[PDB]
């Protein structure tokens, strides 16, 4: 439960 990383998919 966190914002996805910049490297995370769509």
């Amino acid at each position, epitope marked *: 439960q*966190a*914002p*996805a*990383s*910049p*490297a*995370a*998919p769509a």
Partner: antibody, heavy 123, light 112 residues
Framework: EVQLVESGGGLVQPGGSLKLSCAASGFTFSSYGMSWVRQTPDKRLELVATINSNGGSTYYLDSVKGRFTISRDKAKNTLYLQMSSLKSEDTAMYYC????????????????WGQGTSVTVSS | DIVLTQSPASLAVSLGQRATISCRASQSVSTSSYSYMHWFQQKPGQPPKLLIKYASNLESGVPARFSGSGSGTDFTLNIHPVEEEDTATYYCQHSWEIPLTFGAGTKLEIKR
């Protein structure tokens, strides 16, 4: 209390087929991405497949692409892993896991694991 | 793909003392706000259990003797004071990118 109960594992012939089931309770199933993680006899953990909360996004381990399908049924709060063209390398304990989804701008950790269902690929 | 390297493979820690387990990622898994590293405990005959999420967040209901730290490539799991029930294999896992991967595990023996 979160509960994840796997079934459908067991002995299956090389080239054969099984469908694993995971009954989820104690949370709003549709709100969570879900994963299958396997543990091989060497005790290594490897993520096999992930499905996002709604079912529109799926990930597969390269070595199971075209062999395995992850799906979910909102009616039954049930997660599935269809396993086809089974190989010796697929012998493992298969865990149903809440989370492991980094889709849709949100990261949800692998916070609940079932007791697991055993698969043995052998003639 | 990211590779996670744990060290050591195994260790024995006297009852009441500190166990320190390391995980190194092949590339950074941190922004300036979040580190995408997690820690699991696998007790004998049990599935993995989440201890720490996003490097330093104690998983709700997990005892305070467990803590996580680190940023970029280098992460630590600290257990202090160790107790008998802490005998287990411990794993790290990142959620930086597809694919999600695990370290190969560190076996903790409690020394009595």
């Amino acid at each position: 209390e979160v509960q994840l109960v796997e079934s459908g594992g067991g002995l299956v012939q090389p080239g054969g087929s099984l469908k694993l089931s995971c009954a989820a309770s104690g949370f709003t199933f549709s709100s969570y991405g879900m994963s299958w993680v396997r543990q091989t006899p060497d005790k290594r953990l490897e993520l096999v497949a992930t499905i996002n909360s709604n079912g529109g996004s799926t990930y597969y381990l390269d070595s199971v692409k075209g062999r395995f399908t992850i799906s979910r049924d909102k009616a039954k709060n049930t997660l599935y892993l269809q396993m086809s063209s089974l190989k010796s390398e697929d012998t493992a304990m298969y865990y149903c896991v809440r989370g492991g989804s980094i889709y849709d701008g949100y990261d949800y950790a692998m916070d609940y694991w079932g007791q697991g269902t055993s698969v043995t690929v052998s003639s | 793909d990211i590779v996670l390297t744990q060290s050591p493979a195994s260790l024995a820690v006297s009852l009441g003392q500190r166990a320190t387990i390391s995980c190194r990622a092949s590339q950074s898994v941190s922004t300036s706000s979040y580190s995408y590293m997690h820690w699991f405990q696998q007790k004998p005959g049990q599935p993995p259990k989440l201890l720490i999420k996003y490097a330093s967040n104690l998983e709700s209901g997990v005892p305070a003797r467990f803590s996580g730290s680190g940023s970029g490539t280098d992460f630590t799991l600290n257990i202090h004071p160790v107790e008998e029930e802490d005998t287990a294999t411990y794993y790290c896992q990142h959620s930086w990118e597809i694919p999600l991967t695990f370290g190969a595990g560190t076996k903790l023996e409690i020394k009595r």
